[PDB]
Amino acid sequence: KEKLNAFLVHDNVAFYQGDVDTVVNGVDFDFIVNAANENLAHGGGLAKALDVYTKGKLQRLSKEHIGLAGKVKVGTGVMVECDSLRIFNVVGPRKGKHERDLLIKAYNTINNEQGTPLTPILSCGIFGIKLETSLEVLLDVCNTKEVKVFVYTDTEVCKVKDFVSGL
Numbered sequence: 168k169e170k171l172n173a174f175l176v177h178d179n180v181a182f183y184q185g186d187v188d189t190v191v192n193g194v195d196f197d198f199i200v201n202a203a204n205e206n207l208a209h210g211g212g213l214a215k216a217l218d219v220y221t222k223g224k225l226q227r228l229s230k231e232h233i234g235l236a237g238k239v240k241v242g243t244g245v246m247v248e249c250d251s252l253r254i255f256n257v258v259g260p261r262k263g264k265h266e267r268d269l270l271i272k273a274y275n276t277i278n279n280e281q282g283t284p285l286t287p288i289l290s291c292g293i294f295g296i297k298l299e300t301s302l303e304v305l306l307d308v309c310n311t312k313e314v315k316v317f318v319y320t321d322t323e324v325c326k327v328k329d330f331v332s333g334l
Contacts, residue, residue, distance in 0.1 A: 168195065169193070169194065175327060183285075183316070183318075184319070185317060191220060196284065198253035200244070200254075200287065201217050203239075203258055204258055205240070206238060207230060207245065208226075209229075213292065213319075221250075224250070228248075233245075239258055240258065242259055242276065243257070246280070257273050260289075262290070262294060267300075267304065273290075274289065274304055274309060275308050285315045287317055288327075298318075298330075302326075
């Protein structure tokens with residue numbers, strides 16, 4: 168019944184390519200993860216595209232609760248319901264000394280949030296973390312329930328395939 172076919176499945180993890188409108192409409196999932204920030208201020212990248220999608224109910228239901236007490240740590244997420252679209256706003260780390268520990272935390276919050284996640288690969292946008300490093304942590308942490316992962320570009324799709332080949 169799923170409209171968009173995964174370009175790759177590895178163990179419990181299925182990989183899709185599309186923009187936000189494409190994956191929200193084509194993929195079966197309980198909630199989508201927004202790769203976000205402390206004040207929840209949507210740039211900028213996937214966060215923008217999601218807020219355009221919403222719109223911008225995401226930013227409004229945002230702050231709101233940021234807002235209500237009162238800002239979000241690296242990460243740690245804030246679920247919002249935008250119509251029939253549940254958005255789990257997760258703060259991934261910036262590149263840095265503690266990026267692997269904070270990446271572990273972020274994916275662990277995703278994995279422990281009830282339902283099938285649709286997540287991007289955290290922090291490999293302007294945060295500067297290598298896609299393959301964030302994907303390594305994603306697979307290590309998200310190792311039981313089914314999880315769906317999306318990327319946008321043909322470059323990203325190749326990096327995912329090559330990394331998964333090496334496994």
